[PDB]
Amino acid sequence: THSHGLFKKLGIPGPTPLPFLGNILSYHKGFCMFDMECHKKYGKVWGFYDGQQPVLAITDPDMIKTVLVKECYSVFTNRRPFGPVGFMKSAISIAEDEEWKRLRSLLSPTFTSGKLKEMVPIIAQYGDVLVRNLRREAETGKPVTLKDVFGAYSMDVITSTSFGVNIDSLNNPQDPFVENTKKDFLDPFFLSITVFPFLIPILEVLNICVFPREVTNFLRKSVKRMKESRDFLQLMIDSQKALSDLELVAQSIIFIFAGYETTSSVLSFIMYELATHPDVQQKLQEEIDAVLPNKAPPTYDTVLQMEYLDMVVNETLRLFPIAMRLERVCKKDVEINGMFIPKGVVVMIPSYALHRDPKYWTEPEKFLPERFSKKNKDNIDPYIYTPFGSGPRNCIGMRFALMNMKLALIRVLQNFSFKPCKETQIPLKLSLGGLLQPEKPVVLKVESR
Amino acid sequence: THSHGLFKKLGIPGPTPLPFLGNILSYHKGFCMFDMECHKKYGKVWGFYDGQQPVLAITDPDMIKTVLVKECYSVFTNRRPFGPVGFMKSAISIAEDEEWKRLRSLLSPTFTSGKLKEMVPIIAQYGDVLVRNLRREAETGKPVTLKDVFGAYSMDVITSTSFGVNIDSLNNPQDPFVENTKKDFLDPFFLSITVFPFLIPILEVLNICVFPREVTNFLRKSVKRMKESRDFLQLMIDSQKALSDLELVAQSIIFIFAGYETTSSVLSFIMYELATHPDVQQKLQEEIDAVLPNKAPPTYDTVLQMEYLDMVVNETLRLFPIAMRLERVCKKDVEINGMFIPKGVVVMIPSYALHRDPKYWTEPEKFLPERFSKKNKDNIDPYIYTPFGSGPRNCIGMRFALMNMKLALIRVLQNFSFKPCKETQIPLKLSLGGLLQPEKPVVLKVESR
Ligand code: HEM
Ligand code: HEM
Ligand SMILES: CC(C)(C)OC(=O)N[C@H](CS[C@H](Cc1ccccc1)C(=O)NCCc1cccnc1)Cc1cccc2ccccc12
Ligand SMILES: CC(C)(C)OC(=O)N[C@H](CS[C@H](Cc1ccccc1)C(=O)NCCc1cccnc1)Cc1cccc2ccccc12
């Protein structure tokens, strides 16, 4: 509790830090609730402490642009030191400074419009393996848990688009490439990571990691089997200033988690809103059958054509942005937009609280997809709606994620309807924990068309 | 490297400790090899350091009796502080002083001759489920890996004799009660545990454990489902100064590992010796069919009748005693048998090196079961052959283990023969690591009678 006078000094407001803790007991209602309050209590800029670590929470559009886009290279290049990581030190979302810039380049031409359109026929082959697994349960009038069957698709899409491994993971729940894959910032351990960051080095010297030393060393070799037995990996092996062999292994892993629990979790958020807003599900099912008659197979070009679908995805991401907040470590005593920012301070943009501020959203907690209509889609600040971040360090797999999810919805809405159950949690309650996820796993009724 | 002058002082010999390490780089050939050398180099008593931790290695029969049996309660009550353990602090093999003595009593009447004879009909039902899984592979002339099919029996015997859960684990490799269950003192981590014991408290304050916080909390509830849905557990619930609820959970866990990888690992050691000594396998198969004609089902009383079988088990345990060494923490500055022992020192008996000393064994590395014949079985010091330890803190499940393994061998040898393969590692090479286990998994040919 030494350097705790920083925010009283600069005349910057915020709640008072206790010695050695900071404002971490304020996380008992999860990040979002503490954010909503602090934006309401203190206004445009506030500060707090994550232990001995100061965090400055900005909410101004032009200030966010300078941090995410303008002075990204100069001042705000990296994210908060996350550890202990072992050999995942080299993963792009963890990597820092000139290793990020060297990895963000060797890995960018993997998500182009040419490579993304070339996965459309392959992501297609799996959207149908979903329908067979849905109709067997649809015929059996027994409520469906989305994240189970949804994640099985995202996992199936990942494995294929990355290494070619084709598994019907749903019916195949007991595969060496399935168990490993399926395996929280407010649990006992990460509370202590945020408060004993001095203990982080104690564990990087023990080969101890937040990723178990087994899954990695299973996929470490599985790749170097694939590497030497011959999608994202075919695009990465051809890329290796070249990629070290343990370095390429670490980039594969982050892709999987990225697309496995985000694609799965977001589709579960989309289906809840369609079922609890039956008129929206009706309008969508109509546009889908306009572009795609006779339950036609969707294409890359036709997916981008569907604009009520894009509206539906964005309003859901507004309500449930799995980022919650975006963060960067400032590296220089640089005053931006008239506010002196000292070195070492973490800058934090509160996405969730921003997406729910009545100052920029009329009826903010209601689900109104027409905010994003090509009529009203211009009154929207690109730096207030930040579901993939912004700028040089924004989400590297945005195009894939958006296309991945829409190819699922189209294939699903052509065939099924989704009704609320009794055990459906209406209105849904989020997590008191540290990620964007539901309290109860999402449960719905599913009827065939 | 402060208190390192202890052994130069007392005039007690041993290898020289480097500062802050001790003699731990001598473990590059595993515990056994360092033990064999030190017994040969220094004689009857030597010392060394496991970090800042002194260890005194005794090899005298009357001195071992005082440590394991006589002054067990007074001086040498506990084993070396093992951590980090979380809630397994209460497990009996970890527990210390008056909690051990309170737990060793509440749990002793679980292994009596009356309770052990009452599992004979239930362990019987599984010895046959092994034969069906062996004959399907026997018919398919494809070499067999013992620890796989053997562990599936020991696991099946454990689950039944403890909670009644009946699973054909072999054909059922993908069960929530099977995956959890199947999941080293010289790897990166425990090297650092032995050298940074000051870091052990740093991890007991993080709920971090050598047992993952998932398997436990799966069986923590699985038991309290069984506890409230209604073998070792039926004998333990009836027992609860009574057993706390998380305390009884911890005792169940240690029973499982105890009997899963010891029963399995020892049967693999027994079958290797029978196959590589075909005449012994022939004599045994003959005695078995004398007590049990027409491939008769073995019984409690008939198992104890078979004395060449007991000889075969003991000689194997001599060659491969999974204990390797027995250890106790001295708690008092007590001079025993004429040698001043300071408080805090760990006393260590080297089982493996003792079992292989030519001073007590003619042809020590050869496999001669007739050492233990009722003719020669008296020239054997009970404190030199210590496969279950000795005295108040000896193996609590010795009777079960010995009976468990013999019920397997009898059911197996009645039906199959075991021949060495080409890929059979002859003569077997042990582990350069820290446990009793083979270099290559054990591979043999199996023919039906
Ligand atoms: C619904 C889907 C997704 C959403 C909403 C999302 C959102 C985000 C956000 C907010 C960031 C941080 C951007 C910033 O700090 O400003 C990020 C980073 C990242 N995402 Fe995504 N993401 C999604 C899916 C994916 C997928 C499918 C991949 C597949 C590879 C992926 C790969 C990455 C990577 C590598 C980063 C780190 C980029 C860097 O640090 O340079 N993401 N994502
Ligand atoms: C081949 C089979 C086994 C062998 C060779 C073996 C050997 C040993 C040895 C050497 C000890 C330490 C004794 C000492 O420190 O002097 C021990 C302890 C123990 N064994 Fe076994 N064991 C076997 C199987 C089992 C089984 C099947 C169980 C089932 C419950 C079991 C339960 C225990 C327990 C609870 C302890 C700790 C006792 C205490 O600390 O008071 N063991 N075993
Ligand atoms: C700042 C603080 C200490 C509070 O927390 C972080 O430092 N944690 C991450 C840095 S490592 C993160 C951890 C990870 C890695 C593999 C498997 C599971 C978890 C990571 O690599 N996830 C990449 C995949 C992904 C995740 C989400 C969207 N798309 C892609 C900061 C961070 C990194 C990348 C994307 C992020 C998106 C939203 C919020 C934070 C993000
Ligand atoms: C002294 C030193 C620091 C080098 O190492 C130990 O402190 N480690 C054990 C103390 S905890 C042990 C660990 C464990 C617990 C659950 C699952 C896996 C591992 C334990 O509870 N295993 C009980 C089961 C068992 C194991 C073997 C034979 N039968 C029963 C010292 C110890 C305890 C009990 C039996 C032992 C037998 C031989 C050698 C050491 C023994």
DSSP collapsed to 3 states, chain A: CCCCCHHHHCCCCCCCCECCCECHHHHHHHHHHHHHHHHHHHCCEEEEEECCCEEEEECCHHHHHHHHHHCCCCCCCECCCCCCCHHHHHCCCCCCHHHHHHHHHHCHHHCCHHHHHCCHHHHHHHHHHHHHHHHHHHCCCCCEEHHHHHHHHHHHHHHHHHHCCCCCCCCCCCCHHHHHHHCCCCCHHHHHHHHCHHHHHHHHCCCCCCCCCCHHHHHHHHHHHHHCCCCHHHHHHCCCCCCCHHHHHHHHHHHHHHHHHCHHHHHHHHHHHHHHCHHHHHHHHHHHHHHCHHHCCCCHHHHHHCHHHHHHHHHHHHHCCCCCCEEEECCCCEEECCEEECCCCEEEECHHHHHCCCCCCCCCCCCCHHHHCCCCCCCCCCCCCCECECHHHCCCCHHHHHHHHHHHHHHHHCCEEEEECCCCCCCCCCCCCCCCCCCCCCEEEEEEC
Contacts of A201 (CB under 8 A, 6+ apart): none
Judge contact between B407 and B302, C-beta under 8 A: no
What distance in angstroms lies between residue A323's CA and the mean position of ligand 3's atoms?
8
CB A188 within 8 A of CB B207: yes
Amino acid (one-letter) located at B378: D
Interatomic CA distance for residues B220 and B87, integer angstroms: 11
SS3 B446: strand
Long-range pairs, A178-185, Cβ under 8 A, ≥24: A179/B179, A180/A215, A180/A218, A180/A219, A181/A155, A181/A256, A181/A260, A182/A151, A182/A155, A183/A212, A183/A215, A184/A433, A184/A434, A184/A435, A185/A31, A185/A433, A185/A434, A185/A435
| Contacts of residue B300, Cβ cutoff 8 Å, sequence gap at least 6 | B116, B117, B120, B403
C-alpha triplet A202, A208, A214: angle, nearest 5°:
175
| Axis crossing angle, helix B146-163 with helix B120-138, rounded to the nearest 10 | 160
Residue B441 zone, left/alpha/beta (φ > 0; ψ -120 to 50; rest): beta
Q: Does B207 touch chain A (CB under 8 A)?
A: yes
Using a 10 angstrom Cβ sphere, with 0-12 exposed, 13-18 middle and 19 or more buried, the burial of residue B423 is exposed
> What's the residue count for chain B?
449
**Element (H or E) spanning B38, and its range?**
helix B30-42
Cβ distance A413 to A295 under 8 Å? Answer: no
3 state DSSP class of B236: helix
Q: What are phi and psi of A351, to 5 degrees?
A: -60, -60
Closest residue in B to A214 (Cα–Cα): B183
Strands A144-145 and B416-420: unpaired
Burial category of B122 from C-beta neighbours within 10 Å (exposed 0-12, middle 13-18, buried 19 and up): middle
Cα A106 to Cα A99: distance, rounded to the nearest angstrom: 11
Q: Are A287 and A406 in contact (CB under 8 A)?
A: no
The answer to whether A116 and A399 have CB atoms below 8 angstroms apart is yes
The C-alpha atoms of residue B133 and residue B155 are separated, in whole angstroms, by: 14
Closest CA to B189 of A193, A189, A88, A203: A203
Residue B17, SS3 per DSSP: coil
CA–CA separation, A96 and A103 (whole Å): 10
Measure the CA dihedral B236/B238/B244/B248, to 10°: 20
Return the structure tokens found at B407.
């019920």
Which tokens is A19 given? Answer: 């010695």
For chain B, say whether A179 makes contact (Cβ under 8 Å). yes
| Residue A298 backbone phi and psi in degrees, to 5 | -70, 150
Give the closest residue to A43 by CA, choosing from A56, A55, A62, A59.
A59
d(CA B147, CA A137): 40
Q: Return all residues near B291 (Cβ < 8 A) that are at least 6 apart.
A: B302, B305, B306
CA distance linking residue A192 with residue A199, whole number of Å: 9
**Residue B146 CA neighbour count, 13 Å, CB half:** 30
Which amino acid residue places its CA nearest to atom 10 of ligand 2? B388
Q: Compute the distance between CA of residue B212 and CA of residue B219 in angstroms, rounded to an integer.
A: 12
Letter for the amino acid at B217? N
> Could you give phi then psi for residue B244, rounded to 5 degrees?
-60, 160
The label of the residue with tokens 């370095």 reads A247
Core vs surface per residue B283-302: b (16+ CB within 10 A) or e = bbbebbbebbeeeebbbbee
Ligand 4 centroid–CA B268 distance in Å is 20
With CB atoms and an 8 Å threshold, state whether A189 touches B173. Answer: no
Rounded to whole angstroms, how far apart are CA atoms B253 and B227? 15
Q: How far is CA B297 from CA A205, B120, B300, B404, B417, in A?
A: 55, 11, 10, 14, 18
Distance CA A38, CA A55 (A): 13
What backbone torsions phi and psi does residue A147 show, to the nearest 5 degrees? -55, -25
* CA B348 – CA B324 distance, rounded (Å): 10
Contact by Cβ (8 Å): B348, B56? yes
Q: Name which of B55, B188, B123 is nearest B410 in CA terms.
A: B123
Closest CA to A41 of A20, A26, A61, A63: A26
Q: How far apart are CA A296 and CA A3, in angstroms?
A: 63
Resolution, in Å, please?
2.8
**What is the pairing mode between strands B54-58 and B346-349?**
parallel
Q: Which of A52, A57, A58 is nearest to A23 (CA)?
A: A52
Task: Determine the 3-state secondary structure of B335 from DSSP.
Answer: strand
Q: For tokens 């260590």, what's the residue? A: B348
B140 contacts: CB under 8 Å, gap ≥ 6: none
Q: What is the DSSP string of B362-385?
A: SSTTS--GGGGSTTTTTSS-TTT-
Place of tokens 């001995």: A52
Size of interface A-B (CB pairs under 8 A): 21
Report how far Cα A233 is from the mean position of its chain's Cα atoms. Answer: 21
Token pair recorded at residue A411: 């294939």
Q: How far is the C-alpha of A183 from the C-alpha of A195, rounded, in Å?
A: 26
* Cα–Cα distance for residue pair A16/A167, rounded to 1 Å: 53
Task: Round to whole Å and give the CA distance between B235 and B163.
Answer: 10
Residue-range domain boundaries for chain B = 1-449
Q: Rounded to whole angstroms, what are the CA distances from A73 to A77, A332, A346, A387?
A: 5, 11, 15, 21
Task: Give B-chain residues touching A180 at CB under 8 angstroms.
Answer: none
Ligand nearest to the CA of A391: 1
Residues 6 or more apart in contact with residue A92 via CB below 8 angstroms: A100, A103, A104, A107, A251, A254, A396
Rg (CA), chain B: 22
Nearest-CA distance A448 → chain B (Å): 32
Beta bridge partners of B387: B389
Distance CA B344, CA B332 (A): 8
Contact A189 B207 (CB under 8 A): yes
CA distances from B141 to B128, B273, B362, B412 (A): 20, 21, 39, 17
Beta bridge partners of A326: A349
Residue that is written with structure tokens 């809840």 in the block = A272
CB A149 within 8 A of CB A134: yes
Residues A84, A85, A89, A92, CA torsion sign: negative
Say which residues have a Cβ less than 8 Å from residue A202's Cβ, sequence separation at least 6: B199, B202
CA–CA gap between residue A137 and residue A144 (Å, rounded): 7
Class of domain A1-449: mainly alpha
To 5 degrees, how large is the angle CA A258–CA A262–CA A265?
155
What is the number of other CB atoms lying within 10 angstroms of the CB of residue B150?
Answer: 24
Give exposure, A415-432, as e/b (b: 16+ Cβ within 10 Å): bbbbeebeebeeebebee
Residues of chain A with Cβ-Cβ distance to B205 below 8 Å are: 192
How many angstroms separate the CA atoms of A303 and A310, rounded?
9
For an interface test with A, the pick among B187, B203, B214 (most A C-beta atoms closer than 10 Å) comes out as B203
**Crossing angle of helices B263-276 and B278-291, rounded to 10°:** 110
Q: What angle do CA A381, A383, A387 make, to 5 degrees?
A: 105
Phi, psi dihedral angles at A20 (to 5 degrees): 65, -10
- Tell whether A209 is in a known binding site: no
* Residue closest to A58 by CA, chosen among A390, A319, A379: A390
A201 cis-preceded (ω within 30 degrees of 0): no
The pairing of beta strand A54-58 with beta strand A346-349: parallel
Tokens read off for A298: 């969707």
Handedness of CA B421, B426, B431, B437 (dihedral sign): positive
Burial letters A130-144, b for 16+ CB under 10 A, else e: bbebbeeebeeeeeb
State the closest ligand 3 atom to the C-alpha of A254, by its place in the atom list counted from 1: 16
Following DSSP, what letter does each residue of B75-96 receive, concatenated?
Answer: T--B-------GGGGGSTTT--
B82 touches ligand 4 (CB under 6 Å): yes
Q: What is the DSSP letter of B69?
A: I
For residue B38, give every residue at least 6 positions away whose Cβ sits within 8 Å of its Cβ, in sequence order, or none.
B14, B15, B46, B48, B57, B350, B353
Closest CA to B177 of B188, B191, B189, B163: B163
Cα B75 from Cα B68, distance rounded (Å): 10
| Distance (Å, whole) CA A176 – CA B56 | 45
Instruction: Name the experimental technique.
Output: X-ray
> What are B443's strand-pairing partners?
B145
Q: B17 — alpha (psi -120 to 50), left (phi > 0) or beta?
A: beta
Q: For chain A, give the number of residues.
A: 449
Cα–Cα distance, A269 to A424 (Å, whole number): 13
Q: How far is CA B444 from the centre of its chain?
A: 23
Token code pair at residue A332: 């220089």
Beta bridge pairs of residue A443: A145
Query: What is the rounded CA–CA span in Å between residue A116 and residue A109?
Result: 10
User: At which residue do the structure tokens 């060793």 appear?
Assistant: B104
Asked whether A82 lines ligand 3 (CB < 6 A), one says: yes
Using DSSP, state whether B419 is helix, strand or coil. Answer: strand
Residue B40: partners with Cβ closer than 8 Å, 6 or more residues away: none
Interface check for A207 against chain B (CB to CB < 8 A): the answer is: yes
Q: How many Å apart are CA B30 and CA B326, to the nearest integer?
A: 15
Whole-number Å distance between alpha carbons of A185 and A169:
28
- A201-239 in b/e form (b: 16+ CB < 10 A) is ebbeebebbebeeeebeebbebbeebbeeebbbebbeeb
Is the Cβ of A173 closer than 8 Å to some Cβ of chain B? yes
CB A38 within 8 A of CB A357: no
Task: Name A327's bridge partners.
Answer: A348
CA distance B55 to B73: 20
Q: How far apart are CA A76 and CA A328, in angstroms?
A: 6
Query: Quick check: helix, strand or coil at residue B213?
Result: coil
